[PDB]
Amino acid sequence: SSSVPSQKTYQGSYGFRLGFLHAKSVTCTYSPALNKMFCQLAKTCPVQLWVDSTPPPGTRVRAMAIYKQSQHMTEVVRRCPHHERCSDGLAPPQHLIRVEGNLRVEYLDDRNTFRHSVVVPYEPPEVGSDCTTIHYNYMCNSSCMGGMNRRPILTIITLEDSSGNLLGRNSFEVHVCACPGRDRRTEEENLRKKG
Amino acid sequence: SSSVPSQKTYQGSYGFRLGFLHAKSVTCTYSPALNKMFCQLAKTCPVQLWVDSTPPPGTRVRAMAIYKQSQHMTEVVRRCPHHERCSDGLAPPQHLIRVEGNLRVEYLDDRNTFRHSVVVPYEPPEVGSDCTTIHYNYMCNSSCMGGMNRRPILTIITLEDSSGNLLGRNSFEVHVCACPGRDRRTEEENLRKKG
Amino acid sequence: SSSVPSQKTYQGSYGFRLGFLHAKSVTCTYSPALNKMFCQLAKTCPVQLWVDSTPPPGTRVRAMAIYKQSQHMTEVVRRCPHHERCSDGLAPPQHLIRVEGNLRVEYLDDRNTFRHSVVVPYEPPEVGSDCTTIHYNYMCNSSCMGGMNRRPILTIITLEDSSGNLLGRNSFEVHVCACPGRDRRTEEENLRKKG
Amino acid sequence: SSSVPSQKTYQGSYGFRLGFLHAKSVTCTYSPALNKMFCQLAKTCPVQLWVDSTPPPGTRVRAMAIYKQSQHMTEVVRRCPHHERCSDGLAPPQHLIRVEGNLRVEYLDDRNTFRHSVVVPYEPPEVGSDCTTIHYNYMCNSSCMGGMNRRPILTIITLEDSSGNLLGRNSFEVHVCACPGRDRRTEEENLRKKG
DNA sequence: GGGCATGCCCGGGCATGCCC
DNA sequence: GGGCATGCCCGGGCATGCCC
Ligand SMILES: *C[C@@H]1C(=O)C2CCN1CC2
Ligand SMILES: *C[C@@H]1C(=O)C2CCN1CC2
Ligand SMILES: *C[C@@H]1C(=O)C2CCN1CC2
Ligand SMILES: *C[C@@H]1C(=O)C2CCN1CC2
Ligand SMILES: *C[C@H]1C(=O)C2CCN1CC2
Ligand SMILES: *C[C@H]1C(=O)C2CCN1CC2
Ligand SMILES: *C[C@H]1C(=O)C2CCN1CC2
Ligand SMILES: *C[C@H]1C(=O)C2CCN1CC2
Ligand SMILES: [Zn+2]
Ligand SMILES: [Zn+2]
Ligand SMILES: [Zn+2]
Ligand SMILES: [Zn+2]
């Protein structure tokens, strides 16, 4: 009956976790200490999917954004009106999160919660590789007036079988911004000094 | 053939000029040194109309915004998409400038230049008074993404007869902002120090 | 019989001349010493038209680009293939020079010389003003491979009556570039040191 | 479901690897330290194919370019518009990579990913020889505006049987430029000093 | 082979909505 | 009223086609 999706980490029976690749305006930078990706608008944000056991055929990978703070959790995360009026052919203009480089992407609007998500098939790593990578794009800055409006979000990645069973769930915070390197360095310093 | 309206001051045969009434977040404050009004979003911005000779019956007062900088002059000033989706009953949501407190306001979209304008009847001062005041409202901040986007505007006020003849023109710069007193003080200080 | 238009200054009986408004990446900067405008791609380049005597009704203003160097004069100046595949509604994509802010702009391809030009009506200055301003845009950098390719151009402005008589002609060099302030300062220094 | 081809080295059951032949503007020079070929536009770039075991009859050799950087991987590498408008009879003008000196070259456009590829038959070395050489040509510089636009590419070379099975994969970075010797020396020095 | 011109890149710093 | 976060701006400097 809740309209807020769970954010609880659940590595599950397949041992599912995420991984991230390792400069003031670098396109993206991940902070392990904050479990937080700092990236730029509409630029590639690679996310690695790691499993210990191979999921069954037909497994899907869903990404959804939610507001991190209790006061805003129940608000659906959407693109701002400006960037909505700004396409790749498939992503509805209201969706914040896109996937690039995938021929089987699906964009969903939940008919009960109104929340947006984007789904791609799970592909196992190629022989000799330990993970599979998805290229996400965030189509607004965290600061956009009328959209995220300086409020932090979480991206929730779920691994789901074809029947809809939850196989695994993970999440990370996102700050989309002009200067990821600056903003990560400042947040990490405030954490150490004042957190 | 130009689509940019004139901004040239023209006091005209009636001696037409503007006047302004005389704190970090005051609702509005006018800088004579900069010929610039600093005011808050959707709050009253009074402008006085002064004439030496009484205009003829059916005279009208039009207000229109243009970008001040040469690089932006040819672009129509519009409300940003966020505030457009935010009414008083008569103002189209795309118009930046509204008039409050007037039963005869007319909002115009130019069919050739696409520029917006707001018009009210000219009313002579009451006996013993030297001027007539119009309460304007600016419906975005100068900073709004997808709108003014930090670009300065001028408001051009024209006195026109019923036939459309230009009787007088004056203009002033406008900065719509959260903190008019701070922003005025900073710009005036930079003018004296570095202008 | 020549396919190269004249560039000879001809102030004519109306006393026609141009004027220019007076920072590393400023949008544009004019060098009187070089008679040369340094501006940015697709940004406003204002040019003032000055006359001593009022031209007759129906006078037009034409702008055309030609290569300045003898070795390239006979080559038609065009947009590069990249920027051609990049509109305002009226300018053909092959034209280098556009006019913004004018409801009566006309773009011409000469059927014999294949050269491009853009024409607007001449409007006399408003009462109290000494000149009329046209906002040109250059849609390629001087450096564009396959277009100007680092070769300098001249813009030729002609004042023509409705019948086609040449009333006046002027010209200026143009360098469209990323950093007008840098490039002007460097060229002026080399002129003084080595010219 | 991905539209980005794998770049993972796979020597495979046949022991497949590449080899390269060993001056500021030399036509080409290969850096083992960088696994990077530096070569000139439209000039021969020989690549050797080495195998430990003889591939089956009907084996084919495919070459394809992808952008090396994560941010650009999902974009198809194409010739820039200028050089596209510049042929050998068989290569489509949009293809960056050509093969010279082969009577059986095939140029392919993938109907799903839109990526370009060039394929020739695999020929075993002549008796006494240890490798077979293919002469590739790169038809734009890495710097070309509207094409690679200064972004590094990889060339992915795949050995495939007639049925389409992947037998082996190798790749190398390519920098197409005016001065291969200069650019190699500079990148190798920056690697040692700052890498 | 030595060197220039020029698009584009930063790391330093401003303006401004919003917070106390 | 005092102060932070954040998009965007520079002036300094690199990479690279082309010139001698
Ligand atoms: C997760 C894996 C790795 O460890 C490297 C980088 C991304 N994938 C493919 C190779
Ligand atoms: C212009 C006049 C005045 O001088 C005061 C203030 C505004 N109006 C009415 C009275
Ligand atoms: C040429 C004239 C002037 O002298 C100023 C600036 C541009 N026009 C209008 C006013
Ligand atoms: C790979 C072989 C060699 O070692 C030499 C040079 C190129 N091929 C033919 C002979
Ligand atoms: C931080 C951000 C900026 O402001 C520019 C330089 C570095 N980064 C990218 C653009
Ligand atoms: C400048 C502005 C603010 O930030 C608050 C205090 C004063 N003013 C109004 C609200
Ligand atoms: C010279 C040019 C640049 O390289 C950036 C800063 C100044 N100018 C505009 C952008
Ligand atoms: C680097 C390049 C040049 O600029 C010329 C000399 C050497 N090389 C070929 C042409
Ligand atoms: Zn946005
Ligand atoms: Zn707004
Ligand atoms: Zn161009
Ligand atoms: Zn090219």
Author numbering:
A (entry chain B), B (entry chain A), C (entry chain B), D (entry chain A): 94 to 115, 119 to 182, 185 to 293
Copy out sentences from the published article reporting this entry, exactly as the authors wrote them.
The human p53 tumor suppressor is a 393-residue protein that in response to cellular stress, acts as a transcription factor by binding as a tetramer to a wide range of DNA response elements, activating various events including DNA repair, cell-cycle arrest, senescence or apoptosis. Mutations in the p53 gene were observed in more than half of human cancers. To uncover the structural basis of rescuing p53 mutants by MQ we investigated by X-ray crystallography high-resolution structures of the core domains of mutant and wild-type p53 bound to MQ in the absence and/or the presence of their DNA response elements. These studies reveal diverse binding modes of MQ to specific cysteine residues that stabilize the proteins and their interaction with DNA.
The MQ-modified structures include complexes of two hotspot mutants: the DNA contact mutant R273H and the structural mutant R282W, referred as R273H-DNA-MQ and R282W-DNA-MQ, respectively. In addition, residual bulks of electron density close to the sulfur atom of C124 are observed in the other two structures, R273H-DNA-MQ and wt-DNA-MQ (P1), but too weak for unambiguous MQ modeling. MQ bound to C229 is observed at high occupancy in all p53-DNA-MQ structures. New hydrogen bonds with DNA bases, mediated by MQ-C277, are observed only in R273H-DNA-MQ and R282W-DNA-MQ. In these structures, the MQ carbonyl oxygen is oriented toward the DNA, interacting with the second base of each CCC triplet (assigned as C9′ in Fig. 9a and C10′ in Fig. 9b). The presence of MQ-C277 in R273H-DNA-MQ instigates a major alternative conformation in the DNA backbones of dinucleotides C9-C10 and its symmetry-related C9′-C10′. As a result, the phosphate groups from the two symmetry-related nucleotides, C10 and C10′, are shifted by 3.7 Å towards the DNA helix center, allowing for CH···O interactions with the two symmetry-related MQr-C277 conjugates from two p53 monomers (assigned as A and C in Fig. 6a). In particular, novel hydrogen bonds are formed between the MQ bound to C277 and DNA bases in the complexes of the two mutants, R273H and R282W.
